[PDB]
Amino acid sequence: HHDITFRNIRFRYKPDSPVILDNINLSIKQGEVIGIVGRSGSGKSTLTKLIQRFYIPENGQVLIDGHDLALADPNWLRRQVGVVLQDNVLLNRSIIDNISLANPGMSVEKVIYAAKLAGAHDFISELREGYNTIVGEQGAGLSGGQRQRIAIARALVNNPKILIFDEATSALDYESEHVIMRNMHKICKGRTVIIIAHRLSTVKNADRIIVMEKGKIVEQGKHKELLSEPESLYSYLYQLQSD
């Protein structure tokens, strides 16, 4: 049973504009953890935008659970997917308000549980003002890696069946990165997960890696299989990022 299916997807952003996704066919099993890699501008984030029906393909179908998103209730869709956003923790509002920024009146218990999964609860709990701390530089002045764990907590708070990690746009501090990687199996448990990976190493242990180039899936498989394919783009990108 595939939680996410693309059939012959063709997409461009505007009537005259270039084709960004070209005959995308992909079927992701429930619970699979998938890494998506490739050069800048290869269409990685575009693929994830279509999962959320932020844009509509000119050809082909996106299905979640066998449900064509053309027909699906948009409120149902918003509830199926949690996205770990970059640069979206609002400095002028509380930690709890940043985590619950979808159903304001939702329980402190649900917030704390998401924060526990995300590896944020412990540091929030040692702040003078706790969850009521104003995130920003005058309030508690959290680090980028602390804000990122808050961003994970937000994505998780409504228990999404699909979790998408947007591509990292900043390097995280050691302790945050360590806590997140130590907690990934807990974060991902029971969910279908898509990680758009800036650094290939991030997704080495994903179930499958999808390699995009110029709007096409050119390669796909486990890390070791992709390295075994002669002259693979994956091997080339790995080589480029190597010490």
Swiss-Prot record:
Signal peptide: none annotated. Keywords: ATP-binding, Cell inner membrane, Cell membrane, Hydrolase, Membrane, Nucleotide-binding, Plasmid, Transmembrane, Transmembrane helix, Transport. One of its GO terms (molecular function) is ATP hydrolysis activity. One of its GO terms (cellular component) is plasma membrane. Residues 4-239 form the ABC transporter domain. It is found in: Cell inner membrane. The keyword Hydrolase applies. Its main location: membrane. ATP binds at residues 38-45. One of its GO terms (biological process) is proteolysis. The complex HlyBD-TolC (OMF) forms a single transport channel across the two membranes, allowing direct export of alpha-hemolysin. This channel is involved in type 1 secretion system. Part of the ABC transporter complex HlyBD involved in hemolysin export. Transmembrane domains (TMD) form a pore in the inner membrane and the ATP-binding domain (NBD) is responsible for energy generation. Belongs to the ABC transporter superfamily. Protein-1 exporter (TC 3.A.1.109) family. In HlyB the peptidase C39 domain, the ATP-binding domain (NBD) and the transmembrane domain (TMD) are fused. Homodimer. This is Alpha-hemolysin translocation ATP-binding protein HlyB. It comes from Escherichia coli. The lineage of its organism: Bacteria, Pseudomonadati, Pseudomonadota, Gammaproteobacteria, Enterobacterales.
